[PDB]
Structure 1
């Protein structure tokens, strides 16, 4: 019987690649999404055409609010409902935009989105994952540049730092239950086609290893390693997949 995985923010880009790779590895998957309904449903349809009854979608807003714990429990619940088990949680969903210290979004909203998606939802999901329980593990999508942050991204950066601490705290606390908790920390990865070519080049030429971005598949490869039988003594580790970017001085 096939294990099952929840991948948050899995309708497109890096989360989608992670879902695809877990599916190719033999996992059944819950494709969580927020706004990307068509892409999510299309992805589930493709995966089920490949192997029947192996993919479902699950919609949720992961912005912080008083109902977020119930939304996070329901995501985990949805994996048990479809597949009867939940072996892997990948916390990939993430809001990302600048919040200068000095658009129509209120600061209350920025806090809720940036800290909710990057940190609090990962925490609540982790809680519900553990509570609802083989090679069980969680993989948090972190950020290789967390200690050399981009200008004006304080709330996003706080979120991702929080996620490091969660990865560590949950690894320690969940180890007695046989649940491993690790991270993958991308540097520059899968720049959107629509992003300006000059801006894409500016970022790509920062990367010592090949002067290029990571593919989504390269990021997925590190997730696949961490959930695998070859990582069974690894917990609390965060693997940078950054081409050396984080090592480069100003």
Structure 2
């Protein structure tokens, strides 16, 4: 009776608001983290205090690399994340692919580039593929009679990547791949009634002289969004209200994509 969400990069910022919002709706929440161990553990205790046995935390590098104990592939670590929900609670109804690295990969003007490829592509595109695969296998290997009634996968994409940010080619490619995954997984998982949608923020919860300048670009309100302005949309899309939506991406950008230089 209590559904389970797995939220990647759940420790802070938008991933934390997504986990908080799903939890508010009655979900048990698997809080994935990579480096933010203290934040993830504090968030868990907050939600477990509000509602016993309502949250767990699991650590994984979603980079496209191996990790030592066979060195452990990204694939294995992805199946293991999904397995953690099944092991704790016997289900996993919602997957939010939120975790994402983001930093410049300039084409113009070290082995960091292999590091960058692995990290940006892994977190943003390849781990989402492997997570959705493990998610879908687990639904597929549940007898029909016992399947949940509202399986939902949300990919966090980017409303502004048709208007790329100068110098972020690999990240922009990765988001594009992610949008690809949304359409391909919606089509292919439809027979198991698993919906696959994207949410794309424009500017959200910006870190002062420059904050002010970015803020002023947004037609609506001339500010970046709050975390909850994004997560409320994620929450709606996972709801039974949205049960006819799949294969689609929703921009939550204040009209930022409508602007031109």
Q: TM-score, normalised by structure 1?
A: 0.97
> 2:87 is matched with which residue?
81
Q: Equivalents in 2 of 1:105, 1:206: separation in Å?
A: 36
SS at match of 1:180: strand
Taking the aligned partners of 1:23 and 1:82, their CA distance within structure 2 comes to 16
Over 4 Å off, 4+ runs: none
Q: CA deviation at 1:191?
A: 1.0
Partners of 2:243 and 2:49 in 1: CA distance? 32
For residues 214-225 of structure 1, the aligned pairs below 5 Å read 214-225=225-236
Residues paired across the two proteins, number: 245
State the match for 2:198 in structure 1: 183
1:65 CA drift (Å): 2.2
CA distance in 2, matches of 1:94, 1:205: 25
- The separation in 1 between residues aligned to 2:245 and 2:105, in whole angstroms, is 35
- 2 CA distance for matches of 1:105 and 1:198? 34
Counterparts of 1:184-223 in structure 2, within 5 Å, are 184-192=199-207, 197-223=208-234
Unaligned runs of 5+ in 2: 67-72, 140-148
Structure 1's unaligned 5+ residue stretches are none
Return the alpha-carbon distance in structure 1 between the equivalents of residues 90 and 228 of structure 2. 28
In structure 1, distance between residues paired with 2:5 and 2:37? 19
Cα displacement (A) at 1:230 = 0.8
Query: Could you tell me the TM-score, scaled by structure 2's length?
Result: 0.93
Name the counterpart of 1:91.
97
Q: Identify the residue that residue 139 of structure 1 maps to in structure 2.
A: 154
Q: Deviations along 1:86-145, whole A, 9 cap, x unmatched?
A: 00000000000001112x761100000001010000000000000011100100000001
- Quote the residue 1:126 is aligned against: 132
Map of 1:174 onto structure 2: 189
Query: Helix, strand or coil for the counterpart of 2:209?
Result: helix
